């Protein structure tokens, strides 16, 4: 009746194993790295990031919020929140060997443009991946942090004698 299958049920077995590993708390990202060396070791030495980053954007339906509202979510927002955070950490780790076309489709989801109740950690890891590609200078105040934190940190640094270095260039 109320049995729910795992949202990585229909995926390629190695991807399934990776997403099973990342589930496991803060040691999820290290375990993701161990998984990738344990597939470099096996018969399929390459790992199909380009297939996983399509599956991460593929949409399926859910009914959340009120009793009745149909909405379409991608995988990245449908799989467990610690799998999410340890994913994006692992994509920071292996960014150079990833296709940009897939990454940008992922980062657009992570940005969560026009959503209530966002994931601050997903948005922040989005920003930190954009900055590392070099397509998210963005000409904004788009920083990983909150406006609250950035303001409370201006408020304290104001109470300190500014240094003779010149790092901002007017």
């Amino acid at each position: 009746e109320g049995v729910e299958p795992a949202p990585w049920a229909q995926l390629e077995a190695p991807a399934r194993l990776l997403l099973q590993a990342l589930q496991a708390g803060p040691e999820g990202a290290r375990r993701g790295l161990g998984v990738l060396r344990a597939l470099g070791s096996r018969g399929w030495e390459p790992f199909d990031w380009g297939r996983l980053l399509e599956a991460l954007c593929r949409e399926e339906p859910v009914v959340q919020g009120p009793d009745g509202r149909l909405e379409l979510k991608p995988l990245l927002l449908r799989l467990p929140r610690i799998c999410q955070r340890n994913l994006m950490s692992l994509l920071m780790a292996v960014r150079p060997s990833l296709p940009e076309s897939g990454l940008l489709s992922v980062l657009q989801i992570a940005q969560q443009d026009l959503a209530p109740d966002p994931d601050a950690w997903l948005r922040a890891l989005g920003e930190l991946l954009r900055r590392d590609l070099g397509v998210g200078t963005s000409m904004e105040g788009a920083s990983p942090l909150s406006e609250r934190c950035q303001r409370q940190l201006q408020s304290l640094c104001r109470g300190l004698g500014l240094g003779g270095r010149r790092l901002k260039s007017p």
Partner: protein, 370 residues
Amino acid sequence: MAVTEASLLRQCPLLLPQNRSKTVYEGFISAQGRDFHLRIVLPEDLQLKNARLLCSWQLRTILSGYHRIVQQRMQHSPDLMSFMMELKMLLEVALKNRQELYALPPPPQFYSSLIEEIGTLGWDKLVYADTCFSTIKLKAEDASGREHLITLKLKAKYPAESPDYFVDFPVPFCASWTPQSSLISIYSQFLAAIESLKAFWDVMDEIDEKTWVLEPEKPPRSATARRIALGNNVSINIEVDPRHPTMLPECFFLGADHVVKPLGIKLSRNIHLWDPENSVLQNLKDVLEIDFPARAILEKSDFTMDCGICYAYQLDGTIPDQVCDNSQCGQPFHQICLYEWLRGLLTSRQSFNIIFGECPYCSKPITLKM
């Protein structure tokens, strides 16, 4: 429009009301250039809590895996118009997901032009093409004499849009695609990337020749790390930058705490002597003031004897003991790790003190007795 008198026309044109009292609609519903048969009978009043909705078997097989959602939406949805909007949205999703089974290209542009372009390339290059003609894969050679592949994935419109290019080598590959460009264009870009990355390949090939590389085995071309072995029961891992390979790498040491310390010390003291005009090996040998072994054991190189969940030996006294009943996996585990793993999976079933499940790596029956 607001009312369901013109908004319904504009958003489902091929639904014709049979009856005067607009209660029986019949006809076709559109989704991604495809019309599906549909007959949607209401009761005497305007209520969807109970209604009939029959389909063609094409549409039923295409709405496989969403029947519950549609049934729920029939009861939850106020109006017919919004139900049709949701149904079109859902169809678009189903088709875009199962894009494999549902498609047809425009041959007069497609099938001929791709063969024309592959002839423009030369038929010594191409090595693979899929029966849907979606995937193709091409080959090229280095001046050093190395084979390097490039996978393309093509859409219904190949020349209109960019084709998805998948390539092994580690730096992100950038291909300026125009609608006027073609396979020779992207192939020239591929050869350009090859001749650029020549130096990195040379370094990693020299390592793979003259050292007992340990834990990548048959490494890909994307890999920048190479855990080299030296002496006995100590190794050094080495990550290399493609743009600046000959420059100093991030490097460190695994093994015995009493053996490793002088190596870190000697590295710290000699690290200023690195020079990016020689080779990595020819710099490492005079930095660490040692020579390497060339496959001191080539058969029993190493079998990772760790938990295969936590990747550690010695979790809280426990040892890797629980293994796979399989010749191809043989992967050890711990009781605790494997219990926490198997208690999750849906396949697993627990008797009194026994859990049967699938081995994580190979998905074969594995038994755990607590």
